[PDB]
């Protein structure tokens, strides 16, 4: 066969509902380090004087007013990527109608009846148009809902703009797509850079550019250049590029590039080539589409040839074969996938689960390994008890005040310890410390040393550096300790005593953060990580972050649903083990991050499968573990809401984040929970399994029934002297079946189907079609024999009695058989269809019965049915239902339902 | 007027759906200390030899098999009170059919149309029967649902019985109502005594008979009497009476009395007289019923007299007046109340809120003060951190092992500290302690000393008494302390040091429990509370009980709903204040239990209104505070799940308990939550407000519309020369209106209505009826003028056109006006009725329109309507809806909706 390139009958869904958005962190590799005239633009913009910067982008310090912002947006486009913009509704309608089969059905309708029989080609074209409108309405509604959902959780930026008719400025939180060039924004800790920026002003601004320049340490970004030569746009200290995060400090900057013109946007990724590699969902949809095309190409030519030879009307035989084939079209797939999944995605939104792209639902129900941190998900993130003590265990007010200085004057992201220390200090002492101490510098947090320092001063003679961090890291750089009010050298005896005391505290679930301080002579230069030396250890703060009340039932439900929860944490091994024990998780033997640095990929992939808790992990370790956990066909989900969780979120088969996360965590995620809870995640997983099961059932039943109709036509058309059913009748039958099937997205799903992670095999559809097609053909042939002999529709002159006689059987059975094949159990007593499906089935059956008796029947070439036919019809339908119910068991035994 | 005794037209609901159960704790007062032949029976039963006890009750040691238990149940009745047995369905159908208006209607129908006009009386009787059937079906379904709900949470008993064909025994948990006399049960801690019992065997069995004998201290019940003279059935140490709890120990006893024959059941309460005093809900229902009777008695005689004088047919005028009056019958109140409340009670069951009696819903939505303990509701009942140390602060293994002995060998109710100590001790040391030590005696917990002791022994030479309890109570009875391994006298310096250290610990939210041990020479006699003297203080255990993750949002929602949460706790004020601060509650200034002992009732009632946290409370203090919190018309709810919370649950306006509570706590409660959570309680309160609002709306709309119809008849009957509508048509109109109103229980309620605690005024119904009745009468008179002149129904010969002309207007407006006078807002845009109500309204309107055109119209004396009438009908309906919508505002301003 092959000839896959020749087949262009498949219409792919737009690559925003499916497939992930490009995240600007596609490694440090670049296409010849960007092209000229783009690097030159950045290099000129970096050192351009601030005075003439205002004229270049038509910007004023006040900001931008409305008419100006629409003018800038029109001139420079919108702050998006080429693939994130929706096509106009008329283009969507046209691309739905120009389907290579909707066209032929209209042309063959024109050709067959053009000479001397009009109103028959027109009605066929009208049926084609009605089917096209139904498909287009379903897809348009579902894409509108999906696009609304994706825009519900979108990274925002704080801009000046101009609010109030008066013309006053403000600070609006607007979606990052609305940023036009020459716009003024302000940046704080945790905000991702929304576009290429020119730093107007900034204090202690550190940005994590690891995505672009590949360096983990945050880089200071100044208002004016303080480095001698630039020679490179990516390292100029006065421009911030899109896709990088702000670690600490504050800034106010100007947007210079936007959308495609952004560094990452053009020639450093995204714009280069396209989405060459499709994900699992797109591959499965393509496989199903190719299977349907193969079925049609095998069957329809034979149906054409048989009737052409038998009846000598090729222009009508071809139309008849195409009309029976259109039931097996691939164009159902865009309508089924979009309508069924977007129904789930909306329903998940009422469960505090926002789905950014539709295909993620497949992973969300298929996930069997869930990697997450212990803080916030297992623990409460609010610490109830805290003790600030010195090395001797006595409570110390100096430790609390030293920690308060660091917590108050740090500009990084807020922490639970920071919140506790700011709340744990009384108002009077806090006011005295604030008035008596002023900030001079800040050395932010990085994982190489795992500390955080703040340099303050009470005068202009000496400065005090106060750094707080995990106990060892602090003890590594401490040379003296403050014991009993005296500064005494920190010998090894005190080292081992402190270590064992803090290990005893850790085994109780208490996290310990040590605090160190130093006095230095006043200096003008910036402080650097080398200044964290010969410190004086003031003491440590031991605090308890208790586990959530709902963590244990959520973990039990997750395990009952087939999901293996794995804890990836950068905290201590003892605290993590205690937390795991308290919530009911089995920590087993713990694996620290230092252990896996010397392991091979095979060794680590084999170890991670039997290891539940990983401790002392750097973000690189988390990403590597998540990557190697997909080794044996597992679908891995990573849940994280941190600055450095973007690679881990992007590397997992599904990334889950929280509405309160940092900007880069929400950008890289596929699912956004409105509250950080494992129970919400479990219920969402259970509900997404239902959505995927409903989608599969939709495709499965439609394809099987339509294959049965095509087989019925193929086997019995040769013996008849006329078409078993007029193609107009077949088009009406398919349209009325689709109207009924509209309510399948709202069906009920057995708890048996969604009890374990779902595995989707597109080749199973062919087996289901082959098994459940001829069952319909048996009763179709029985109906043919009924109308031939019992009702004497033996000649073409009385063909209309035959054809209509099949029509009501064709539509009613195909509509009824849904309630038999939708479940593996016995219907109407064990598993029952949802009320919308019941109502739609009843309505479509009534319409199909009443159509031959309606005034339209003459126009549709349908003849009224004698009353002696209805008992036969009921017998046929009941026999078909009973036979399929009795035969379902064999399919269950040999292959299985799920 | 008065003559309230004469009015027996009111049919009260059965006193199980409304009103509380007896709760065998009705003080210590008795009716002459019970009657003779009951006290004598108990006295003879107590001292009767165990050998001959088996023949008396036809009981075997192995238990009772089936046929024997049904025989005993038939002979002795069922273990219930006379007010808890439902009446048979046929008796319920008779009482629903024999009400004076269903009898007078039938009798007048026979009288008026018996002579020469049969099939007119029969159809009227058939309409009466159909109305009775509808009412009976609604009430029967709703009482069945309510009785099923009350049986879901019922105190159970553990019985031997017989299981399976073999004849082997087990231990079944059967509802206490199934207990027949001469049944063998076993009792553990926390089990209430289900019937009068004879103790067969007992291991350290203590029962709290504070309800019966009035003494707070638990007393020891033995297998054989160990006291010289009994002289009193209530103080014999070998019988346990119903309504008392088991504090500690284990036992196996025999049931000797059951149901009424129980000491409490007969002549000691719940038997003499009856429920003389009705509660608030019953009083309100009676007031509404009396208002409806007053309306009918004022109006219907005038309607009879006018038509009797005008048309000279008294036997028909009386029937017509009664037919218009029956719309205002109080017999709908049993159907309205039972059907609307039960639908709520069922809906609460899916929200983990079981309602034991329907009227409690009224209180549940009317609650504005909620009194709870801090443990379990505000805090988790599991403790995350525990430190067992000595007085010097060093960790001590002896303290942990001493606490483990007490926790393991105590037979009382389990505690969070007991669970932690049993889990906090390693397996090896635990098994070593279990093998090395054996239990001898136990001194249970009581609030006078607030300690609990266990006497064990490692040999037959000396015994060790290990008591554990709150710090002061332990320190009161301690004379020595184990310091640095030496037993040193406990001087005042150590007392102050320990007090300040433990006060520092309690300000952190850490509860401190001290442990004391003593060595005594071996002795045969039982140990007594006195034996707790000159103890040796081993140390204390400080543990953290963390607040729940969901307590703060639940408290904020409760405050937003208008409920004032007050904390009644027996713990320290420092720990309670810290817990309140953690969850966001404002403790204010705390009031300890010792402060309120000297206060007067007025002083304590005034103080409790502005006090949020009450600490160091005995159960008597809790009951007194809850009683005095209802002083200014507040509705008080008490939530508790303890042994001593029965008086406080019974004294509150509503009592809430948990499914895992003790037996007496579930018996005294009105609401049972399936999980102990404040969020569940808040959502249940919100949804119960909806149920009560729906019930009030039901009554209000029905009464107002039917009053409007009666007024329309009263004003315009004199001018017409015939009845404005035949009474058959009026009965059909009322029946079809009731069919529509069936779906009101499922209506939607605006969030504005249920945003504050509900206050129900039965006199408001009269104002609503007076305001909204004549609005219907205006358009009824307009319809009369229409049919008189526009349609020329001027004579009796053409009366049928007139009457039917009103009929469709009468039914359709009455059915439509629901969607206008159900909300204070504008309908269909700002507030919408529920889909069941929409469907029922449409169906009833369709039936009313189609009835005059149906073949039944001739049988019902209805004439088909000309098509020129329908535009006038739409005009009348639209004008009525618009006028009532515009006029609703005046009722809102002058009186108000809620
Ligand atoms: Mg932001
Ligand atoms: Mg600096
Ligand atoms: Mg078929
Ligand atoms: Mg029990
Ligand atoms: Mg004893
Ligand atoms: Mg009316």
Curated annotation (Swiss-Prot), chains A, B:
<keyword id="KW-1003">Cell membrane</keyword>
<keyword id="KW-0812">Transmembrane</keyword>
<dbReference type="InterPro" id="IPR018303">
    <property type="entry name" value="ATPase_P-typ_P_site"/>
</dbReference>
<protein>
    <recommendedName>
        <fullName>Magnesium-transporting ATPase, P-type 1</fullName>
        <ecNumber>7.2.2.14</ecNumber>
    </recommendedName>
</protein>
<feature type="transmembrane region" description="Helical; Name=10">
    <location>
        <begin position="867"/>
        <end position="886"/>
    </location>
</feature>
<keyword id="KW-1133">Transmembrane helix</keyword>
<feature type="transmembrane region" description="Helical; Name=4">
    <location>
        <begin position="318"/>
        <end position="335"/>
    </location>
</feature>
<feature type="topological domain" description="Cytoplasmic">
    <location>
        <begin position="1"/>
        <end position="94"/>
    </location>
</feature>
<feature type="transmembrane region" description="Helical; Name=2">
    <location>
        <begin position="117"/>
        <end position="137"/>
    </location>
</feature>
<dbReference type="GO" id="GO:0043231">
    <property type="term" value="C:intracellular membrane-bounded organelle"/>
</dbReference>
<dbReference type="GO" id="GO:0015662">
    <property type="term" value="F:P-type ion transporter activity"/>
</dbReference>
<feature type="topological domain" description="Cytoplasmic">
    <location>
        <begin position="745"/>
        <end position="766"/>
    </location>
</feature>
<feature type="binding site">
    <location>
        <position position="709"/>
    </location>
    <ligand>
        <name>Mg(2+)</name>
    </ligand>
</feature>
<feature type="binding site">
    <location>
        <position position="738"/>
    </location>
    <ligand>
        <name>Mg(2+)</name>
    </ligand>
</feature>
<dbReference type="InterPro" id="IPR008250">
    <property type="entry name" value="ATPase_P-typ_transduc_dom_A_sf"/>
</dbReference>
<feature type="transmembrane region" description="Helical; Name=7">
    <location>
        <begin position="767"/>
        <end position="790"/>
    </location>
</feature>
<keyword id="KW-0067">ATP-binding</keyword>
<feature type="topological domain" description="Extracellular">
    <location>
        <begin position="309"/>
        <end position="317"/>
    </location>
</feature>
<comment type="function">
    <text>Mediates magnesium influx to the cytosol.</text>
</comment>
<keyword id="KW-0597">Phosphoprotein</keyword>
<feature type="transmembrane region" description="Helical; Name=9">
    <location>
        <begin position="832"/>
        <end position="851"/>
    </location>
</feature>
<dbReference type="InterPro" id="IPR023298">
    <property type="entry name" value="ATPase_P-typ_TM_dom_sf"/>
</dbReference>
<feature type="topological domain" description="Cytoplasmic">
    <location>
        <begin position="819"/>
        <end position="831"/>
    </location>
</feature>
<dbReference type="Pfam" id="PF00690">
    <property type="entry name" value="Cation_ATPase_N"/>
</dbReference>
<feature type="transmembrane region" description="Helical; Name=1">
    <location>
        <begin position="95"/>
        <end position="115"/>
    </location>
</feature>
<feature type="topological domain" description="Extracellular">
    <location>
        <position position="116"/>
    </location>
</feature>
<dbReference type="InterPro" id="IPR006415">
    <property type="entry name" value="P-type_ATPase_IIIB"/>
</dbReference>
<keyword id="KW-0460">Magnesium</keyword>
<dbReference type="InterPro" id="IPR006068">
    <property type="entry name" value="ATPase_P-typ_cation-transptr_C"/>
</dbReference>
<feature type="topological domain" description="Extracellular">
    <location>
        <begin position="716"/>
        <end position="724"/>
    </location>
</feature>
<dbReference type="GO" id="GO:0015444">
    <property type="term" value="F:P-type magnesium transporter activity"/>
</dbReference>
<feature type="binding site">
    <location>
        <position position="331"/>
    </location>
    <ligand>
        <name>Mg(2+)</name>
    </ligand>
</feature>
<dbReference type="Pfam" id="PF00122">
    <property type="entry name" value="E1-E2_ATPase"/>
</dbReference>
<keyword id="KW-1278">Translocase</keyword>
<comment type="similarity">
    <text>Belongs to the cation transport ATPase (P-type) (TC 3.A.3) family. Type IIIB subfamily.</text>
</comment>
<dbReference type="GO" id="GO:1903830">
    <property type="term" value="P:magnesium ion transmembrane transport"/>
</dbReference>
<feature type="binding site">
    <location>
        <position position="641"/>
    </location>
    <ligand>
        <name>Mg(2+)</name>
    </ligand>
</feature>
<feature type="binding site">
    <location>
        <position position="645"/>
    </location>
    <ligand>
        <name>Mg(2+)</name>
    </ligand>
</feature>
<keyword id="KW-0997">Cell inner membrane</keyword>
<dbReference type="GO" id="GO:0005886">
    <property type="term" value="C:plasma membrane"/>
</dbReference>
<dbReference type="InterPro" id="IPR001757">
    <property type="entry name" value="P_typ_ATPase"/>
</dbReference>
<dbReference type="GO" id="GO:0046872">
    <property type="term" value="F:metal ion binding"/>
</dbReference>
């Amino acid at each position: 066969m092959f000839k896959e390139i020749f087949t262009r009958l498949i219409r792919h869904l737009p690559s925003r509902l499916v497939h992930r958005d490009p995240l600007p962190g596609a490694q440090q590799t670049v296409n010849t380090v960007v092209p000229p005239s783009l690097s030159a633009h950045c290099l000129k913009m970096a050192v351009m004087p601030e005075e003439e910067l205002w004229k270049t982008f038509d910007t004023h310090p006040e900001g931008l007013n409305q008419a100006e912002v629409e003018s800038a947006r029109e001139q420079h486009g919108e702050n998006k990527l080429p693939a994130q913009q929706p096509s106009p509704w008329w283009v969507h309608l046209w691309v739905c109608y120009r389907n290579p089969f909707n066209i032929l059905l209209t042309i063959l309708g024109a050709i067959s009846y053009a000479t001397e029989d009009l109103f028959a080609a027109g009605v066929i074209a009208l049926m084609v148009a009605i089917s096209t409108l139904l498909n287009f309405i379903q897809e348009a509604r579902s894409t509108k809902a999906a696009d609304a959902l994706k825009a519900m959780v979108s990274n925002t930026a704080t801009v000046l703009r101009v609010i109030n008719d008066k013309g006053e400025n403000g600070w609006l939180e607007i979606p990052i797509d609305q940023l036009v060039p020459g716009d003024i924004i302000k940046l704080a800790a945790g905000d991702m850079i929304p576009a290429d920026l020119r730093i107007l002003q900034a204090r202690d601004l550190f940005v994590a550019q690891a995505s672009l320049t590949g360096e983990s340490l945050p880089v200071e970004k100044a208002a004016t250049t303080r480095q001698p030569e630039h020679s490179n746009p990516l390292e100029c200290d006065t421009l911030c590029f899109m896709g990088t995060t702000v670690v600490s400090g504050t800034a106010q900057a100007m947007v210079i590039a936007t959308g495609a013109n952004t560094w990452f946007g053009q020639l450093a990724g995204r714009v280069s080539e396209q989405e060459s590699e499709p994900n699992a969902f797109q591959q499965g949809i393509s496989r199903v589409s190719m299977l349907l095309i193969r079925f049609m190409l095998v069957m329809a030519p034979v149906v054409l040839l048989i009737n052409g030879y038998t009846k000598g009307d090729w222009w009508e035989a071809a139309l008849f074969a195409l009309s029976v084939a259109v039931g097996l079209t691939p164009e159902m797939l865009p309508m089924i996938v979009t309508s069924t999944l977007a129904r789930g995605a909306v329903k998940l939104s009422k469960q505090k689960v926002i789905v950014k792209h539709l295909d993620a639902i497949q992973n969300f129900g298929a996930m069997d390994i869930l990697c997450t941190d212990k803080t916030g998900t297992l623990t409460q993130d609010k610490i109830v008890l805290e003790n600030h003590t010195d090395i001797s265990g006595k409570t110390s007010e100096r430790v609390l005040h030293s920690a308060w200085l660091n917590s108050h004057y740090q500009t990084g992201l807020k922490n639970l310890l920071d919140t506790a220390v700011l709340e744990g200090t009384d108002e009077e002492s806090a006011r005295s410390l604030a008035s008596r101490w002023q900030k001079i510098d800040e050395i932010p947090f990085d994982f190489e040393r795992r500390r955080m320092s703040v340099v303050v001063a009470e005068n202009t003679e000496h400065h005090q550096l106060v750094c707080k961090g995990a106990l060892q890291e602090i003890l590594n750089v401490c040379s003296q300790v403050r014991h009993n009010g005296e500064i005494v050298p920190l010998d090894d005896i005190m080292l081992r005593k402190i270590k064992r005391v803090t290990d005893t505290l850790n085994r109780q679930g208490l996290r310990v953060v040590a605090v160190a301080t130093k006095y230095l002579p006043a200096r003008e230069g910036d402080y650097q990580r080398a200044d964290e030396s010969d410190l004086i250890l003031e003491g440590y703060i031991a605090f308890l972050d208790p586990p959530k009340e709902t963590t244990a039932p959520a973990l039990k439900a997750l395990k009952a649903s087939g999901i293996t929860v794995k804890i990836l944490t950068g905290d201590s091994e003892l605290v993590a083990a205690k937390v795991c024990h308290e919530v009911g998780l089995d920590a087993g033997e713990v694996v620290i991050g230092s252990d896996i640095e010397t392991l091979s990929d095979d060794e680590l992939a084999n170890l991670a499968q039997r290891t539940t808790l990983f401790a002392r992990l750097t973000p690189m370790h988390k990403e590597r573990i998540v990557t190697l956990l997909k080794r044996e066909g597992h679908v891995v989900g990573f849940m994280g809401d941190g600055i450095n969780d973007a690679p881990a979120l992007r590397a997992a088969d599904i990334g889950i984040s929280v509405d309160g996360a940092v900007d880069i965590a929400r950008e890289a995620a596929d699912i956004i929970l409105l509250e950080k809870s494992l129970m919400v995640l479990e219920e969402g997983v259970i509900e997404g399994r239902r959505t995927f099961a409903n989608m599969l059932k939709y495709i499965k039943m439609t394809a099987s029934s339509n294959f049965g109709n095509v087989f019925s036509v193929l086997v019995a058309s040769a013996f008849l002297p006329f078409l078993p059913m007029l193609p107009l009748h077949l088009l009406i039958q398919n349209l009325l079946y689709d109207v009924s099937q509209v309510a399948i997205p709202f069906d009920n799903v057995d708890d048996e189907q969604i009890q374990k992670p779902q595995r989707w095999n597109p080749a199973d559809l062919g087996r289901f079609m082959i098994f459940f097609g001829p069952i319909s053909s048996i009763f179709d042939i029985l109906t043919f024999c009924l109308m031939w002999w019992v009702f004497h529709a033996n000649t073409p002159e009385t063909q209309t009695l035959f054809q209509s006689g099949w029509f009501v059987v064709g539509l009613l059975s195909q509509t009824l058989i849904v309630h038999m094949i939708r479940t593996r159990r016995v219907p109407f007593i064990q598993s029952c269809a949802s009320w919308p499906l019941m109502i739609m089935t009843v309505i479509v059956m009534i319409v199909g019965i009443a159509l031959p008796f309606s005034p339209l029947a003459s126009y549709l070439q349908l003849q009224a049915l004698p009353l002696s036919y209805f008992p036969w019809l009921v017998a046929i339908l009941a026999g078909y239902m009973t036979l399929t119910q009795l035969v379902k068991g064999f399919y269950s035994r040999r292959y299985g339902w799920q």
